[PDB]
Amino acid sequence: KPLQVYTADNQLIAEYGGKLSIPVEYKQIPPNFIHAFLAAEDSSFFQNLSKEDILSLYVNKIFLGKNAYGIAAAAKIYYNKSINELSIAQMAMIAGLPKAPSKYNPVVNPERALERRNWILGRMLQLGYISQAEYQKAVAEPINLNMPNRDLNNIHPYAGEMVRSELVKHFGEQAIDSGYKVYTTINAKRQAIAEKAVQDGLEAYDRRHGWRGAEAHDKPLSEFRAYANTYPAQVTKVNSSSFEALMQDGSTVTVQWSGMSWARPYRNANSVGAAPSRASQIVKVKDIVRLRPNEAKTAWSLVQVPKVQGQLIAINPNDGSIEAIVGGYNFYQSKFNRALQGWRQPGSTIKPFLYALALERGMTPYSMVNDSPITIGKWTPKNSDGRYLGMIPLRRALYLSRNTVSVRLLQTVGIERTRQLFMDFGLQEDQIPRNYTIALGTPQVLPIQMATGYATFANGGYRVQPHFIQRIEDAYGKVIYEAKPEYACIPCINAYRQAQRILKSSSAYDMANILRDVIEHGTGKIGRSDLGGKTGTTNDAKDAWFAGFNGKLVTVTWVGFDQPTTLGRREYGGIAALPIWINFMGQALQGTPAAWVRLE
Amino acid sequence: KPLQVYTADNQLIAEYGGKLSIPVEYKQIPPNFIHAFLAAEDSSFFEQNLSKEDILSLYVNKIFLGKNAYGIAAAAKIYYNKSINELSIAQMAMIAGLPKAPSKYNPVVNPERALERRNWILGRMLQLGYISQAEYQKAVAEPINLNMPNRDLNNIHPYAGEMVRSELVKHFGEQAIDSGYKVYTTINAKRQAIAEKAVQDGLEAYDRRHGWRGAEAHDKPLSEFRAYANTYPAQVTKVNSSSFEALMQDGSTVTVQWSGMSWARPYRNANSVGAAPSRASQIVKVKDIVRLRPNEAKTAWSLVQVPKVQGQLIAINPNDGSIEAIVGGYNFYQSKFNRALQGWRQPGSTIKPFLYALALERGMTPYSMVNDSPITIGKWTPKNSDGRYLGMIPLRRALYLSRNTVSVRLLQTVGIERTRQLFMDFGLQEDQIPRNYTIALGTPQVLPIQMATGYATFANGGYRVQPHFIQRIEDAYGKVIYEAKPEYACIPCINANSQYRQAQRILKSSSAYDMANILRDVIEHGTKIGRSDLGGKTGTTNDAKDAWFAGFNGKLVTVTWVGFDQPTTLGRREYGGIAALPIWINFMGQALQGTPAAWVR
Ligand SMILES: *C(=O)[C@@H](NC(=O)Cc1ccccc1)[C@@H]1N[C@@H](C(=O)O)C(C)(C)S1
Numbered sequence A: 001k002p003l004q005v006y007t008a009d010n011q012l013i014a015e016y017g018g019k020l021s022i023p024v025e026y027k028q029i030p031p032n033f034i035h036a037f038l039a040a041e042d043s044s045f046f047q048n049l050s051k052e053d054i055l056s057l058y059v060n061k062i063f064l065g066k067n068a069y070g071i072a073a074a075a076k077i078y079y080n081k082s083i084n085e086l087s088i089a090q091m092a093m094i095a096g097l098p099k100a101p102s103k104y105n106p107v108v109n110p111e112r113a114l115e116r117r118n119w120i121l122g123r124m125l126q127l128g129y130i131s132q133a134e135y136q137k138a139v140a141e142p143i144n145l146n147m148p149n150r151d152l153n154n155i156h157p158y159a160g161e162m163v164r165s166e167l168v169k170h171f172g173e174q175a176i177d178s179g180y181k182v183y184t185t186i187n188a189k190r191q192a193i194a195e196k197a198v199q200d201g202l203e204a205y206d207r208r209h210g211w212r213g214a215e216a217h218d219k220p221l222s223e224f225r226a227y228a229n230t231y232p233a234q235v236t237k238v239n240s241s242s243f244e245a246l247m248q249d250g251s252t253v254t255v256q257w258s259g260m261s262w263a264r265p266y267r268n269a270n271s272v273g274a275a276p277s278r279a280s281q282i283v284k285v286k287d288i289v290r291l292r293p294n295e296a297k298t299a300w301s302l303v304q305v306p307k308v309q310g311q312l313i314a315i316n317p318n319d320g321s322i323e324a325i326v327g328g329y330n331f332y333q334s335k336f337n338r339a340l341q342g343w344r345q346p347g348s349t350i351k352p353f354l355y356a357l358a359l360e361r362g363m364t365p366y367s368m369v370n371d372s373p374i375t376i377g378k379w380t381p382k383n384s385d386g387r388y389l390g391m392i393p394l395r396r397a398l399y400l401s402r403n404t405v406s407v408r409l410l411q412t413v414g415i416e417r418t419r420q421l422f423m424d425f426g427l428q429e430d431q432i433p434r435n436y437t438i439a440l441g442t443p444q445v446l447p448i449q450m451a452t453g454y455a456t457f458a459n460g461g462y463r464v465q466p467h468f469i470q471r472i473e474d475a476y477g478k479v480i481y482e483a484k485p486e487y488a489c490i491p492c493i494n495a496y497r498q499a500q501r502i503l504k505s506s507s508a509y510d511m512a513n514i515l516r517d518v519i520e521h522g523t524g525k526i527g528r529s530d531l532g533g534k535t536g537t538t539n540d541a542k543d544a545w546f547a548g549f550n551g552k553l554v555t556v557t558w559v560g561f562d563q564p565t566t567l568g569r570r571e572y573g574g575i576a577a578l579p580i581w582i583n584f585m586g587q588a589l590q591g592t593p594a595a596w597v598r599l600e
Numbered sequence B: 001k002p003l004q005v006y007t008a009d010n011q012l013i014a015e016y017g018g019k020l021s022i023p024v025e026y027k028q029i030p031p032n033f034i035h036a037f038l039a040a041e042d043s044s045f046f047e048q049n050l051s052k053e054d055i056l057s058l059y060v061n062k063i064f065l066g067k068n069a070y071g072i073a074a075a076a077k078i079y080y081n082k083s084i085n086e087l088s089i090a091q092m093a094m095i096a097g098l099p100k101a102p103s104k105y106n107p108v109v110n111p112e113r114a115l116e117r118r119n120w121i122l123g124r125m126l127q128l129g130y131i132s133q134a135e136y137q138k139a140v141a142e143p144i145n146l147n148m149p150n151r152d153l154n155n156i157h158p159y160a161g162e163m164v165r166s167e168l169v170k171h172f173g174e175q176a177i178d179s180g181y182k183v184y185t186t187i188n189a190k191r192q193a194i195a196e197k198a199v200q201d202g203l204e205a206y207d208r209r210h211g212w213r214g215a216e217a218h219d220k221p222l223s224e225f226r227a228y229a230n231t232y233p234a235q236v237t238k239v240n241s242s243s244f245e246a247l248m249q250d251g252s253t254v255t256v257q258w259s260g261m262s263w264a265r266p267y268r269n270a271n272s273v274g275a276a277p278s279r280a281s282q283i284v285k286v287k288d289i290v291r292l293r294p295n296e297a298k299t300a301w302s303l304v305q306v307p308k309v310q311g312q313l314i315a316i317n318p319n320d321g322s323i324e325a326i327v328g329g330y331n332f333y334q335s336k337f338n339r340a341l342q343g344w345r346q347p348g349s350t351i352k353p354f355l356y357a358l359a360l361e362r363g364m365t366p367y368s369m370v371n372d373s374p375i376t377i378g379k380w381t382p383k384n385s386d387g388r389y390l391g392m393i394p395l396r397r398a399l400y401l402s403r404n405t406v407s408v409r410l411l412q413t414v415g416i417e418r419t420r421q422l423f424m425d426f427g428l429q430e431d432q433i434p435r436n437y438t439i440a441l442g443t444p445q446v447l448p449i450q451m452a453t454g455y456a457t458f459a460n461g462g463y464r465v466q467p468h469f470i471q472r473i474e475d476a477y478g479k480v481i482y483e484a485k486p487e488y489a490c491i492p493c494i495n496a497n498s499q500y501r502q503a504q505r506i507l508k509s510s511s512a513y514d515m516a517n518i519l520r521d522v523i524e525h526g527t528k529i530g531r532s533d534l535g536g537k538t539g540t541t542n543d544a545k546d547a548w549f550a551g552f553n554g555k556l557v558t559v560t561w562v563g564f565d566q567p568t569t570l571g572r573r574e575y576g577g578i579a580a581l582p583i584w585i586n587f588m589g590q591a592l593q594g595t596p597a598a599w600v601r
């Protein structure tokens, strides 16, 4: 009975197998398996004939490492076999595990596992349990593990992992042995769109910065996995216009010129080399490259897995329901979820919160703010273009993300009030400094916290908590948990708990319209008039961000390197992150009526 | 509901607690405990959390919290011997930090990391307004304060209880304990208590004759020493002419008079002891950690000494192989090692009755004339105890005097391998039996339990029995789930796929009966106990590195052994009949008291 993960459309996406036990009748056990356990210890005092009687009591319960309880569960976990399918060597291997299922574990210690196994086989031969023909056959055998994957998460991997990883973080492994059915808030349609959007957008950035060379050279093809419609290939021959590579299935294909001609060499973030003139300039024989098919087959392409990363988090602003979550380029490349764990500087994406607080103090989008050099704090922050503009309205200041006005508004608003709003988005006391650096978006945030923060505009100034579980049922079918979220607007549940108000209705509604002005009048791609959004770029374009919404959906996208480096000069939030956001929102919001903030 | 260990005479001797879970109603949980789990993680996605509080109720009694603890109540019991409402804020925070990795943060395994995690949580609890700063300073300054109760109770017959736990765990792992079963052993409690006293007195006898070896420590702390085998650590505070004064672990100061320490002839070596002490300063120094023994009144104290020497006793029923008594060393609290089941030693002349039984097999009798003459085996001429020879002598005289030359001659007569096969058929390990003429003088390594199995062959009429310690196992519901089906030497004897297994015959009835009587005459001629149904053989290895005695009656086989764990000489006077035999006599006399004569048939 495994932990089962479903989407909001009651569709099964993941099964997570915990503690396994397959009880067998003593008669169903091959004698050689019993013999293996009898030879496992030198001395029995319960020859070993009374151990055979007491063995029946423990045979289905013995912990045999890696969630295996009993002989059948160990035959399944280690070899993907039934007890009668096991070899003498395999039976002896399992027979050696009870004493210490970690010091002898063939996964965690293959060295000692073989030593123990063969000792048992040696003892079985001495006891006349096995013949020498069986002894030589068995002792010469390798470990031969064929471990089936009991953690099935192949449909929406980041969504299934989110459930497993979060339950384990808060409650340990016992959370997976409960056999519960977890019914998530995830929209599968929206989840699929987000997965494609993050993959395409990162492939877009990667392609424009050029070919970086093969992912490895003189390394073994067995050590690389296929994913995101990219398949590892070992280059075998390089010609005038085409190369030949060996696939993991054993086949060899011929990647033609049109499939590699894009490979202008990467020189730096801001520089790429001339278009390649021959295939030798792109690949070397014994290079580990990634290839891509077409629809069915026909032709192949030389592709590249981005070194760059990204994320997407989409939440319902009224309750905080998580609709879509993508933690990186691909789950197989990295199981790391940047949406829930990727601490980054928000840069300019923080400004709408600070400018909302200015509006709360009495200001308007038209209020005159001053873009001037700020020496104050014996630290002089400089604007993006190293320029100043003088007196400009609050709305202009936000749109151009004038760093000097932000520090001035932070001095006006007070560092305390700013930190209070931030904590209301899920932030900890320890992750927001007191200093005037918070006006510039330098403190580390998780994108989920940004989606929570932007939801404040979308919902009219209420504090919603992001949540991924709608209900949990026990294996039987009984509902044991039913989500009771804090609602921004309780009447709105037509197309119990009330969320506390964190920002004044007018300020949340005003910021919303400034953000809509920012997207409709600044930048320029969708046929919607209910969208508000803000771009963000940190110092030396170390992060590209876009936080945007409509009345029914908040989406935050991010693009950057895991080890912080520049994305390039001409690489801002609106260039790297925005195209993923547009591509998601357009598709996710397709055939849905206009929904905007309610000034109540 | 722990693994319970009983004797054959129905005494509960040990309780072994495995996986623990004490389910509690969510309402019964102190809010500070819930708050601790709330502050344990930075972000929850299932200031306030709320979502976690609802999902916590589902796992609160099942969360694995390390060291067999499942749920908050089990962790409160295991780590602190407290109920959840008795926990401090610091303790609640400690348990709250364990779910994520109950080993990387375990306070019993990794205390440093555990302290860092706990305080981080307390810090987090203060930030959220869960705890006040007064509670924060109070809690953060607290130590680990572990008060782990002992869930493995075994203080009646410790070697017997440990035998069950250690053997189930060896063969079946920890899951063998969390089963809640009732194990009904073959152990006789009366006999077990006698054996415990016998092994303790006999080793104290050897130790005392060998002299005082000095205090167990000097200038060290009295808190670091345990009391056991009726010996209590004392720190010497004053040394008078004829007496000394020592501080006890309870805080009292006792006076040890001259008669209490006068035995303390100083130990020089196994073969040498110093002159009788003339004054108390020659025995003790002020600040010496000594061991004392009271009388029954606690009105007189004695200076005693824990033997450096070891011993064992194993008593089994020869008809089925039931283990009646087992003592693995001087005391379980000095060493948890069981020398009866794990102590591999050379048997010495304790092996000759096996070899002489095979001589009888082929056709010989106790009266058959054998040759005590000088025997050359390659570049090794074995010499008898006294180096002398006796010429033609009957087989029984040869065994009694343990004439090494007749043994090698009998080994040549029966054949090296045909003997190895028989030694194995007696219960000795194939790999542990060499392929040479020295197996005649007991060179192999044996377990005493194997010797008791082998001697039971004489006692039972030539059958091979297997030693067993479990009579039956019942589940928690009272249902018998296991019932021992041993191989019986004599099935009719109990009434004084099959229901009753008949043990395999390994000797002709005549040769087992003949060896038995040879062994009885070995014992009657130069033993003490008022019994005529006892047969036995002494054993001494080269340089008295081992003193042995293997003896029986029709109902009980007892094997005793005396020696050092790191093989050294016991001394020159120290043969099997001197060191081991007195423990055997002392046990057998008391164990067989008020029982009719029982001999082989
Ligand atoms: C907030 O993100 C702003 N960042 C900065 O002013 C610092 C900076 C920006 C680019 C390179 C080096 C340093 C603004 N981010 C973008 C944006 O909002 O899209 C601008 C390019 C307008 S600056």
Ligand SMILES: *C(=O)[C@@H](NC(=O)Cc1ccccc1)[C@@H]1N[C@@H](C(=O)O)C(C)(C)S1
Binding pocket: B348, B349, B350, B384, B385, B401, B402, B404, B537, B538, B539, B540, B541, B542, B543, B544, B575, B576, B577
């Ligand atoms: C068997 O134990 C025999 N021992 C030896 O040959 C070696 C030895 C060791 C110490 C002293 C003398 C000889 C013989 N049988 C034992 C016995 O049965 O007790 C003797 C010590 C008599 S010698």
